[PDB]
Amino acid sequence: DIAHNLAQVRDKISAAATRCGRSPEEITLLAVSATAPASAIAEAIDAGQRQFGENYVQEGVDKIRHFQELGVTGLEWHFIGPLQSNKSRLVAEHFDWCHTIDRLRIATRLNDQRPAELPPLNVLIQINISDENSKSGIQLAELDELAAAVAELPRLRLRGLMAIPAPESEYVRQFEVARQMAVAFAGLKTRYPHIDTLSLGMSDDMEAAIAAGSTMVRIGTAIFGA
Ligand SMILES: Cc1ncc(COP(=O)(O)O)c(C=O)c1O
Ligand SMILES: Cc1ncc(COP(=O)(O)O)c(C=O)c1O
């Protein structure tokens, strides 16, 4: 039951925030509905969920159009998969957030292909913080350059950072890696305007991500199953 899992996930989030002195409202739950059918999302929506994350463009754009013509309003769609240049038009036309900005060219395409009547696309720069087997995300030493360039684009809005750490089961390493992301985030937050989103943490490391300072956790299986 999706509505029951939603409530169970929000309990774990609220628990973890409270334990480390944070207000539960500081942590946005982003329900990762990738691979989940539109019927399952519609249940989630009925249980009050409004923020949904998708890994693949055409799957995501089809859900977006579905709930639009149903006249369902007030949703927020986040593209959280790797973004190919040949699919950026659809992200720039249909999504509200994109978490995977890791090269300036792809961000300039999104800015150019973004219709003017829409609000700027909120974007996070993705950091490869600890995953040597991943080609996704920049190194921290490139952050200031990429952030400055991306910050300039008028149809985008730089909101913060995202990382998918390498899989880790030792809580100590989970926390140390997320702290590195929280430190970079704080550093960016001082100089850049409207930096308010650290997209970090999934079910396996949710506690350490929240204790380290994440503002948004990405939960998929624990909501929709597989
Ligand atoms: C294995 C795989 N999955 C998904 C995609 C992209 O999915 P979508 O067409 O929904 O954007 C690609 C792109 O070719 C792919 O190679
Ligand atoms: C970004 C992301 N978070 C989470 C999951 C799985 O959800 P859970 O956090 O419960 O492991 C997946 C895929 O289903 C995912 O792609």
Author numbering: 3 to 228
Task: Please quote the authors directly.
We serendipitously discovered that the K36A variant of YggS, affecting the lysine residue that binds PLP at the active site, is able to bind PLP covalently. This observation led us to recognize that a number of lysine residues, located at the entrance of the active site, can replace Lys36 in its PLP binding role.
Here we report a detailed characterization of the Escherichia coli ortholog of PLPHP (YggS) with respect to its PLP binding and transfer properties, stability, and structure. YggS binds PLP very tightly and is able to slowly transfer it to a model PLP‐dependent enzyme, serine hydroxymethyltransferase.
